[PDB]
């Protein structure tokens, strides 16, 4: 605080670590599904949340949420993950409508966010 | 169900009865039934007319009805056209000669039942219940009520969890028997459910 | 009529502190004259002296 003190030893900047380190400063990363499964969320919620453990291109083994209703993913399915954490230990989302992950069926609103092409009529 | 009915506790002292006749155990039940019928009919008919109190009084095998209403003009219609019509039906209901009298209610804001009815109507036509209640209270006060209370209950503003709210103004002594407490009730059959409206109007204390 | 015998710009607004056609419906800017109204903005008795 004291100017002399500051001079002696300056002020330390708070180094904030990244909450999506398996990306390694990439907007998305390609990965292969090591396994796909459902998981129960913590309190107070209740569901069977669809999630896949993904071995990434850069070597990391992470677990990625699968948004939307329904998915085609199996083991050995090449998917793109984007970062974003579902509110234990899931810090990433599968990009629907990229690589092997399909767009959500019968969806008409927020279509972009689930890979869905524009409905023709 | 805490409270005693304010009319009912005072029938011997400051409040009078509505049905005012004598009958032996033989004919009493029948008479009561008749009264119920006629009253029901009247309510059905004179809904649009602001009617407070039907007073039935049967001497000598002939029924005398007395309708207390705020606007006689709509109950009477053209001079002795609607009243007459009412009479024959009343007679039919009873099975005796009928006679309808129509008392004109001075100050319908001070009559409790009428106020309640008004409130119910308001509720039905989708006003803010609270604003209606306020209006009811205020108006009575303006008119010269020593006090008024109103209470409304259940599904207020179509809310899932029902509750009761009530506005008092002035003094409304219920434990005091000699207090002229005009009490009455009504029910708003809204889209979300029933909303019950109670209203107490304290005219003043009687000294005897 | 704009602008005839009973004009707006030449004399004044019929209503008090109102553009007859449409602007100023409170008490803040008494005087502004838009092109859509071609109207002054004063009292109801202002036309009696003009």
């Amino acid at each position: 605080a004291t100017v002399n003190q500051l001079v002696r030893k300056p002020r330390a900047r708070k180094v904030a670590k990244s909450n999506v380190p398996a990306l390694e400063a990439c907007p998305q990363k390609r990965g292969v599904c090591t396994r796909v499964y459902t998981t129960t969320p913590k309190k107070p919620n209740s569901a069977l949340r669809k999630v896949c453990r993904v071995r990434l291109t850069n070597g990391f083994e992470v677990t990625s949420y699968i948004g939307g209703e329904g998915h085609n993913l199996q083991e050995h399915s090449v998917i793109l993950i984007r970062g974003g954490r579902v509110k234990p230990g899931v810090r990433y989302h599968t990009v629907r409508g990229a690589l092997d992950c399909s767009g959500v069926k019968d969806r008409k609103q927020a279509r972009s966010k689930y890979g869905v092409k524009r409905p023709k009529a | 169900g805490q409270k005693v009915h304010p009319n009912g506790i005072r029938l011997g002292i400051v409040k009078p009865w509505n049905s005012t006749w004598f009958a032996n155990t033989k004919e009493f039940a029948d008479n009561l039934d008749s009264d119920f019928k006629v009253r029901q009919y009247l309510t059905k008919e004179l809904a649009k007319a602001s009617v407070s109190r039907i007073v039935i009084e049967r001497p000598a095998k002939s029924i005398r009805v007395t309708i207390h209403t705020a606007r006689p003009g709509i109950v009477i219609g053209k001079k002795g056209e609607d009243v007459e019509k009412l009479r024959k039906v009343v007679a039919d209901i009873a099975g005796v000669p009928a006679q309808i009298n129509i008392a004109e209610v001075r100050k319908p804001e001070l009559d409790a039942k009428l106020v309640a009815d008004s409130i119910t109507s308001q509720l039905e036509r989708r006003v803010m219940f609270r604003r209606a209640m306020k209006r009811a209270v205020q108006n009575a006060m303006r008119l010269g009520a020593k006090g008024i209370k109103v209470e409304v209950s259940g599904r207020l503003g179509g809310a899932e969890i029902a509750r009761t709210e009530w506005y008092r103004e002035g003094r409304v002594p219920l434990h005091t028997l000699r207090a002229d407490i005009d009490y009455n009730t009504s029910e708003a059959h809204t889209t979300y459910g029933v909303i019950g409206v109670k209203v107490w109007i304290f005219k003043g204390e009687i000294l005897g | 009529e704009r602008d005839g015998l009973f004009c707006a710009r030449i004399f004044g607004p019929v209503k008090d502190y109102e553009c007859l056609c449409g602007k100023y419906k409170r008490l803040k800017h008494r005087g502004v004259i838009c092109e859509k109204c071609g109207v002054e903005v004063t009292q109801t008795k202002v036309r009696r002296e003009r």
Partner: protein, 205 residues
């Protein structure tokens, strides 16, 4: 790059008459100008602090027919320039070629004026200018070219204008169909209902 939808809807939303239709027929007859658009029009709860500002911004933008990025740019320019920011912005808006044309009375609406500008009808100092955003300067004569001078719409527009109040900052000739942008307008010359300050605040978040 333009708003192509219902014009009166916008006006309704705003509350005021934005002058998005010529003014032959009064706005109250064409639409429920008091009632807001859509299913939930009759309901009107008091707006937020942010919201009012936003609305104000929209109004101004709507009036001139300027999309958001452009508007932002204009605001920035105003800020950069010396003097009062809101006023400057207003001046800039006015300065637009299409707006100027509208003022003159060669377009019934601002939209019409813009269209005319686009279609190589208008000249500024005897040189065909096609850009609606073109900032017209002081002493810059602006006219209809001889090809577009025969159009019935132009005369109608002029007539409409003649009914409408004449701006002091211009000087227009109906026969010659050429107007001189004499000077950039003062704030007093413009409409008082526009709260420029709100707009300024909105961008000063």
């Amino acid at each position: 790059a333009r708003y192509l939808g219902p014009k009166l809807k916008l006006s309704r939303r705003e509350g005021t008459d934005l002058f998005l239709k010529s003014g032959v027929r009064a706005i109250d007859t064409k639409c429920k100008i008091e009632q807001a658009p859509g299913q939930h029009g009759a309901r009107k709860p008091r707006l937020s602090d942010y919201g009012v500002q936003l609305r104000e911004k929209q109004k101004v933008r709507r009036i001139y027919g300027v999309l958001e990025r452009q508007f932002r740019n204009y605001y920035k320019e105003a800020a950069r320039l010396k003097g009062n920011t809101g006023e400057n912005l207003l001046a800039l808006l006015e300065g637009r070629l299409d707006n100027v044309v509208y003022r003159m009375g060669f377009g019934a609406t601002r939209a019409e004026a813009r269209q005319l500008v686009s279609h190589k009808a208008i000249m500024v100092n005897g040189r065909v200018v096609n850009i609606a955003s073109y900032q017209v300067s002081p002493n810059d004569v602006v006219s209809i070219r001889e090809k577009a001078k025969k159009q019935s719409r132009v005369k109608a527009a002029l007539e409409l204008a003649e009914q409408r109040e004449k701006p002091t900052w211009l000087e227009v000739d109906a026969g010659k169909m050429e107007g001189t942008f004499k000077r950039k307008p003062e704030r007093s010359d413009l409409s008082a209902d526009i709260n420029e300050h709100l707009i300024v605040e909105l961008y000063s978040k």
